[PDB]
């Protein structure tokens, strides 16, 4: 699990469940080609969408379908989705995880990176 | 601009919090918090003139924001009773401090920015 | 009364970010982003005049903040290439939108305020 | 499991905040905070097994994080003296509590997630 995305719902005080996660990689033609997709559990965490072998150096992008969740929960959201664009494995392999705290019309993204 | 400013924004409505009790305390020689200044948040959420620059001496200060009052009125059950921030003041010169709070029913974030007059 | 305002702060130095490039795009009918506006962040970190109220159509918008450029000079290698904020503007009608982004070398938070 | 857990990160370094002191106080009937539990944040940046469910009671609590000491060790000048989270525990029934804090030299955020076990 080189990449893991954790999603939490602030207003409900419970992990956000059933939000779509989509991962893209920048290609040589500066175009985003799909990399992986996932579905977040009731624990609020989606993992295993990427393996170390498939993961390689490049500029990625993670999309979280925060729009559909709040319609399902009945809230009108401001943000269509959350996008986190970052270079990966610039100097050797590393472990990247992206945490997202979600509210209607407000969200935060934090990334902690460990070498092993 | 006052040396201490407090701004609160609401996540659920995307608007600044209105009518939130804010309390300021100052440390004492006996390590006991003493009341320093109290205010009521406006609709804009920005409060100025709470403490005068001359009456803002170097020391340890605490600012509290009434989280329960805002949410018990609007109808959402709070997780936090209130938000408290503690910091040193006037270590070197009379700087201006701004304390910004992003408010959510079960979360909040606090940031501090300093401006030199 | 600029409908779109971008506010950027630097948590590491506790001061507003200075000399930050910001770009704004609007989605086209071909589902492709097309440049809409751009600017340069001042010392205060608050930007105005990026767009006009009259020329603010009801479409999907994206805001890009050149986080990598800022922290490259300051000497701390940043995690994020940049910051992206995607939203559907003028869903119910004209209004004022404020986008506030708190920056850290390895984290950032975005909050939206409507007048 | 553990009724209350506190998990802390660092923002500028992109690493968990290690060697950070955590102190928990419980409010008394005399409005006096009693030292309830104290711990040190692990290398993973999280603290677990802080309180027993039997020891945990239905009252107002408080969590303190030693922000000042952490930045002194790493060599960066911090703004905040400490981080304080206050809430009402077991208002209705026993539930799991998790308090998350993301630290930066001049800002920090606190989020709380509660689920019925």
Swiss-Prot record, chains B, D:
<dbReference type="GO" id="GO:0001523">
    <property type="term" value="P:retinoid metabolic process"/>
</dbReference>
<dbReference type="GO" id="GO:0005179">
    <property type="term" value="F:hormone activity"/>
</dbReference>
<keyword id="KW-1008">Amyloidosis</keyword>
<feature type="binding site">
    <location>
        <position position="46"/>
    </location>
    <ligand>
        <name>L-thyroxine</name>
    </ligand>
</feature>
<dbReference type="GO" id="GO:0003105">
    <property type="term" value="P:negative regulation of glomerular filtration"/>
</dbReference>
<feature type="modified residue" description="Sulfocysteine">
    <location>
        <position position="2"/>
    </location>
</feature>
<keyword id="KW-0225">Disease variant</keyword>
<dbReference type="GO" id="GO:0035578">
    <property type="term" value="C:azurophil granule lumen"/>
</dbReference>
<feature type="modified residue" description="4-carboxyglutamate; in a patient with Moyamoya disease">
    <location>
        <position position="34"/>
    </location>
</feature>
<dbReference type="GO" id="GO:0070062">
    <property type="term" value="C:extracellular exosome"/>
</dbReference>
<keyword id="KW-0765">Sulfation</keyword>
<keyword id="KW-0964">Secreted</keyword>
<dbReference type="GO" id="GO:0007603">
    <property type="term" value="P:phototransduction, visible light"/>
</dbReference>
<comment type="function">
    <text>Thyroid hormone-binding protein. Probably transports thyroxine from the bloodstream to the brain.</text>
</comment>
<feature type="glycosylation site" description="N-linked (GlcNAc...) asparagine">
    <location>
        <position position="90"/>
    </location>
</feature>
<dbReference type="GO" id="GO:0042802">
    <property type="term" value="F:identical protein binding"/>
</dbReference>
<feature type="binding site">
    <location>
        <position position="109"/>
    </location>
    <ligand>
        <name>L-thyroxine</name>
    </ligand>
</feature>
<feature type="modified residue" description="Phosphoserine">
    <location>
        <position position="44"/>
    </location>
</feature>
<keyword id="KW-0732">Signal</keyword>
<dbReference type="GO" id="GO:0005615">
    <property type="term" value="C:extracellular space"/>
</dbReference>
<keyword id="KW-0301">Gamma-carboxyglutamic acid</keyword>
<keyword id="KW-0034">Amyloid</keyword>
<keyword id="KW-0622">Neuropathy</keyword>
<keyword id="KW-0325">Glycoprotein</keyword>
<dbReference type="GO" id="GO:0032991">
    <property type="term" value="C:protein-containing complex"/>
</dbReference>
<dbReference type="GO" id="GO:0140313">
    <property type="term" value="F:molecular sequestering activity"/>
</dbReference>
<comment type="subunit">
    <text>Homotetramer. Dimer of dimers. In the homotetramer, subunits assemble around a central channel that can accommodate two ligand molecules. Interacts with RBP4.</text>
</comment>
<keyword id="KW-0963">Cytoplasm</keyword>
<comment type="similarity">
    <text>Belongs to the transthyretin family.</text>
</comment>
<dbReference type="GO" id="GO:0042562">
    <property type="term" value="F:hormone binding"/>
</dbReference>
<dbReference type="GO" id="GO:0044877">
    <property type="term" value="F:protein-containing complex binding"/>
</dbReference>
<dbReference type="GO" id="GO:0005576">
    <property type="term" value="C:extracellular region"/>
</dbReference>
<dbReference type="GO" id="GO:0006144">
    <property type="term" value="P:purine nucleobase metabolic process"/>
</dbReference>
<keyword id="KW-0795">Thyroid hormone</keyword>
<keyword id="KW-0597">Phosphoprotein</keyword>
<keyword id="KW-0813">Transport</keyword>
<keyword id="KW-0372">Hormone</keyword>
<protein>
    <recommendedName>
        <fullName>Transthyretin</fullName>
    </recommendedName>
</protein>
<feature type="binding site">
    <location>
        <position position="7"/>
    </location>
    <ligand>
        <name>L-thyroxine</name>
    </ligand>
</feature>
């Amino acid at each position: 699990c080189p990449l893991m995305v954790k999603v939490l719902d602030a207003v409900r005080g419970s992990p956000a469940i059933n939000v779509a996660v989509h991962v893209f990689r920048k290609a040589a033609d500066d175009t985003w080609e799909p990399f992986a997709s996932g579905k977040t559990s009731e624990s609020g965490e989606l993992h295993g969408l990427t393996t170390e072998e498939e993961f390689v150096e490049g500029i990625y992008k993670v999309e979280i379908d925060t729009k559909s969740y709040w319609k399902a929960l009945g809230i009108s959201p401001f943000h269509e989705h959350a996008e986190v664009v970052f270079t990966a494995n610039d100097s050797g392999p590393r472990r990247y995880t992206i945490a997202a705290l979600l509210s209607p019309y407000s969200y935060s993204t934090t990334a902690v990176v460990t070498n092993p």
